[PDB]
């Protein structure tokens, strides 16, 4: 089977420093383990399209 | 006999550490150390 899960982005305890590690846990009838999985705030993609690859002065990008 | 809501616990091996035939775990620095580091079955001494 698969779950779909996430770190909910607002729910991290956060502040001035990032949480750099998290635990992934299974609680089956028969077994549990944690494991220190990393997380990254590098989520999804950003792609940046400029109306030209070049400009002069007195233009707007 | 009894139908349990309890699971049988699984049993778990050694990861980064070497594992003997019993399921005990031992450091990889003790594989082919030439002592018997695995208590009974010396899998650390197999075919070196």
UniProtKB/Swiss-Prot annotation, chain A:
Q: Which organism is it from?
A: Homo sapiens (Human)
Q: What is this protein called?
A: Complement C5 beta chain
From Swiss-Prot, chain B:
What disease involvement is noted?
Complement component 7 deficiency: A rare defect of the complement classical pathway associated with susceptibility to severe recurrent infections, predominantly by Neisseria gonorrhoeae or Neisseria meningitidis.
Can you say where in the cell this protein is located?
Answer: Secreted; Target cell membrane
Similarity remark:
Belongs to the complement C6/C7/C8/C9 family.
Explain the purpose of this protein.
Component of the membrane attack complex (MAC), a multiprotein complex activated by the complement cascade, which inserts into a target cell membrane and forms a pore, leading to target cell membrane rupture and cell lysis. The MAC is initiated by proteolytic cleavage of C5 into complement C5b in response to the classical, alternative, lectin and GZMK complement pathways. The complement pathways consist in a cascade of proteins that leads to phagocytosis and breakdown of pathogens and signaling that strengthens the adaptive immune system. C7 serves as a membrane anchor.
Oligomer status and interactors? Monomer or dimer; as a C5b-7 complex it can also form multimeric rosettes. Component of the membrane attack complex (MAC), composed of complement C5b, C6, C7, C8A, C8B, C8G and multiple copies of the pore-forming subunit C9.
Q: Which residues of the full protein are shown?
A: 72 to 119 of 843
Q: Which cysteines are joined by disulfide bonds?
A: 14-25, 20-38, 32-48
**What does the UniProt PTM comment say about this protein?**
C-, N- and O-glycosylated. O-glycosylated with core 1 or possibly core 8 glycans.
Q: Where is the LDL-receptor class A domain?
A: 12-48
Compositionally biased region (Acidic residues)? 37-48
Q: Can you tell me where the transmembrane regions are?
A: none
Q: Which domain of life is it from?
A: Eukaryota
Q: What name is this protein filed under?
A: Complement component C7
């Amino acid at each position: 089977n698969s779950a779909i899960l996430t770190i909910q982005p607002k729910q991290l305890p956060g502040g001035q420093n990032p949480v750099s590690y998290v635990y992934l846990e299974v609680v089956s009838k028969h077994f549990s383990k944690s494991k220190r999985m990393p997380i990254t705030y590098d989520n999804g993609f950003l792609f940046i399209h400029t109306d030209k690859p070049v400009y002069t002065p007195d233009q707007s990008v | 006999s009894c139908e349990p809501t309890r699971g049988c616990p699984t049993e778990e091996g050694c990861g980064e550490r070497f594992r003997c035939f019993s399921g005990q775990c031992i450091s990889k620095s003790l594989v082919c150390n030439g002592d018997s580091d695995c208590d009974e079955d010396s899998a650390d001494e197999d075919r070196c």
